[PDB]
Amino acid sequence: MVYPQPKVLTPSRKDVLVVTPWLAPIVWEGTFNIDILNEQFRLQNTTIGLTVFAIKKYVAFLKLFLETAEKHFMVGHRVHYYVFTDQPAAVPRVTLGTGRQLSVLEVGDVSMRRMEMISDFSERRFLSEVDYLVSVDVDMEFRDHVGVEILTPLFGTLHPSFYGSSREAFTYERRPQSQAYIPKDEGDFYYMGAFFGGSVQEVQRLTRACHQAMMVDQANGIEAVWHDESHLNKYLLRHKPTKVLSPEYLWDQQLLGWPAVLRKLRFTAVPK
Amino acid sequence: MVYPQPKVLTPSRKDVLVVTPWLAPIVWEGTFNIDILNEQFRLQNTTIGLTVFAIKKYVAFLKLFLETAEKHFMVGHRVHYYVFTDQPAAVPRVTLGTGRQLSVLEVGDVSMRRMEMISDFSERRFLSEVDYLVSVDVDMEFRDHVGVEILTPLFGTLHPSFYGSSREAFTYERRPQSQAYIPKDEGDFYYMGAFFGGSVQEVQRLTRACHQAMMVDQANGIEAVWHDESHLNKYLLRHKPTKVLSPEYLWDQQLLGWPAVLRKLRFTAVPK
Ligand SMILES: O=c1ccn([C@@H]2O[C@H](COP(=O)(O)OP(=O)(O)O)[C@@H](O)[C@H]2O)c(=O)[nH]1
Numbered sequence: 001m002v003y004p005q006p007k008v009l010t011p012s013r014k015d016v017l018v019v020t021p022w023l024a025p026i027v028w029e030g031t032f033n034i035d036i037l038n039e040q041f042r043l044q045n046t047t048i049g050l051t052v053f054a055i056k057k058y059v060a061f062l063k064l065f066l067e068t069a070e071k072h073f074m075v076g077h078r079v080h081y082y083v084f085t086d087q088p089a090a091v092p093r094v095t096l097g098t099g100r101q102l103s104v105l106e107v108g109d110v111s112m113r114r115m116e117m118i119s120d121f122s123e124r125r126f127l128s129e130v131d132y133l134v135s136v137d138v139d140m141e142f143r144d145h146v147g148v149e150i151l152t153p154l155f156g157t158l159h160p161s162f163y164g165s166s167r168e169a170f171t172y173e174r175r176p177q178s179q180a181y182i183p184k185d186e187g188d189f190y191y192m193g194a195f196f197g198g199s200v201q202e203v204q205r206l207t208r209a210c211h212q213a214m215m216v217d218q219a220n221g222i223e224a225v226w227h228d229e230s231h232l233n234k235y236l237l238r239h240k241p242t243k244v245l246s247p248e249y250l251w252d253q254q255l256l257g258w259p260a261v262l263r264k265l266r267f268t269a270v271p272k
Numbered sequence: 273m274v275y276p277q278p279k280v281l282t283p284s285r286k287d288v289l290v291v292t293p294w295l296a297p298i299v300w301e302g303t304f305n306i307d308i309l310n311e312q313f314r315l316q317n318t319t320i321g322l323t324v325f326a327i328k329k330y331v332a333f334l335k336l337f338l339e340t341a342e343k344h345f346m347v348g349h350r351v352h353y354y355v356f357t358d359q360p361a362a363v364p365r366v367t368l369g370t371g372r373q374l375s376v377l378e379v380g381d382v383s384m385r386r387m388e389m390i391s392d393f394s395e396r397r398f399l400s401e402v403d404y405l406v407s408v409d410v411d412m413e414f415r416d417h418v419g420v421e422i423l424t425p426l427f428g429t430l431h432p433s434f435y436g437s438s439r440e441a442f443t444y445e446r447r448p449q450s451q452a453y454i455p456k457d458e459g460d461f462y463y464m465g466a467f468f469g470g471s472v473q474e475v476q477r478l479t480r481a482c483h484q485a486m487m488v489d490q491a492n493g494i495e496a497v498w499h500d501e502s503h504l505n506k507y508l509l510r511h512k513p514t515k516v517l518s519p520e521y522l523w524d525q526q527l528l529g530w531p532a533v534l535r536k537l538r539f540t541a542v543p544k
């Protein structure tokens with residue numbers, strides 16, 4: 001299946017880090033050939049589950065989120081959307097391509113809901129067919145390809161406000177009394193809670209660990225500074241991800257524009 | 273466990289490709305922090321088996337190969353050397369560091385011996401404790417660190433004579449009648465038969481496939497142009513490796529000097 005030969009003596013990128021110091025790829029445009037990856041993943045009949053929460057007024061974001069996911073997310077691969085909502089009847093009936101299904105799961109501090117709910121759900125036997133789970137915010141739209149290049153045992157996503165920051169500027173939980181605590185001299189990246197995922201087993205492990213950490217902090221009267229993102233960051237510090245997604249995958253154009261290191265804006269915040 | 277923070281806006285290398293188009297790291301100096309990797313691998317009590325053939329006059333290369341492996345190969349990790357030889361009594365008694373053991377396996381066209389022998393051996397139950405297998409040439413010496421940065425499910429090594437070559441210059445098997453055949457318009461890299469490895473299961477699969485391909489070619493009266501390296505290259509074309517080692521890991525300084533893209537010469541050919 002012919003494609004350009006890789007060029008050993010030409011860097012993929014001269015302006016960004018494309019592999020972490022523990023040899024996990026950092027996924028930017030120009031670092032992958034999607035035709036090779038699509039083949040690898042279709043040979044395994046890869047099924048991707050996508051979880052999204054749309055609780056209270058956030059059910060209004062589902063229409064664009066699902067319409068644009070159908071244009072850009074994992075097209076050609078098997079996809080199952082799992083929409084967690086307090087308003088199942090408000091979920092828009094969006095037309096889906098072949099091989100793609102959607103289920104609505106009704107949901108009943110609430111800071112723990114996402115990690116609690118994904119943890120319980122990720123352990124269910126009806127996921128036997130799903131290979132990877134991906135968890136994203138709903139108040140977002142896809143604008144360009146998000147595909148199997150992201151898939152791996154465990155991935156997080158560089159927060160778009162902090163990718164250029166030094167670690168002491170990262171808003172990690174800094175109180176030693178919290179289970180999310182990270183010392184000022186530690187930290188590889190600051191990951192955003194709005195896009196993470198991995199194999200079902202790695203997502204079971206991450207969401208369990210985060211939910212259990214959050215319950216310990218609650219018992220102790222402490223709420224981490226950025227809630228489940230704080231616990232995501234302590235988790236991925238100690239269990240390093242096998243791919244890191246660049247901020248192409250989680251961007252806010254109104255806040256941050258279209259800077260030179262972004263060749264594509266793939267999944268972006270919806271305003272107000 | 274503190275180490276420098278990764279720099280998102282600084283490339284690891286500006287002179288070489290450090291990730292393949294299917295997102296496998298290509299391992300060069302400055303792309304890994306061995307302290308992070310050593311920790312990950314020691315947490316799993318990683319045991320590395322190293323196979324080497326020393327048949328006929330090549331038993332003379334074992335002394336330096338094992339003395340320098342003790343200085344540079346996987347130091348701190350569990351290592352078991354498996355020396356395949358027709359002269360077990362000629363194997364030098366080299367003093368080994370703690371956690372490192374050596375076994376001698378006596379061996380009885382012969383072009384098939386390496387893939388046949390590693391295939392049979394890799395399936396034995398006494399490997400239950402070994403996590404990865406690495407297969408190298410004996411007429412070589414280690415000069416610098418070769419460590420757990422190479423470990424992964426499946427890896428090959430860029431041939432030091434061809435890393436700068438275009439694919440039509442690669443000495444793949446080009447006859448359609450051989451099981452090793454690769455079309456002129458296909459090929460990612462040219463891997464050398466002198467350093468490859470992976471998990472035990474991936475090495476079982478690669479050496480079986482290569483041995484079975486070689487037996488088909490023998491039945492058909494054809495010998496691939498570069499023998500088991502030709503079949504290694506067809507295998508890794510179709511089953512792409514999860515890391516690629518740069519030519520730091522397989523070099524010939526007498527032939528090729530110390531060019532600018534090599535920051536370290538880690539495992540090099542012994543002359544004449
Ligand atoms: O270091 C690189 C360079 C390119 N590519 C990808 O391989 C394909 C072809 O790359 P090329 O630069 O040759 O693009 P072309 O000029 O043929 O359009 C595209 O999907 C690139 O993003 C890659 O994965 N790593």
Ligand SMILES: O=c1ccn([C@@H]2O[C@H](COP(=O)(O)OP(=O)(O)O)[C@@H](O)[C@H]2O)c(=O)[nH]1
Pocket residue numbers: 017020021022276282283284285301302303304305306
């Ligand atoms: O893109 C990079 C840059 C550095 N490192 C490694 O991380 C460690 C520290 O890197 P640094 O450049 O900060 O070296 P220092 O100047 O502190 O000696 C060394 O093992 C480097 O090879 C890496 O894995 N990827």
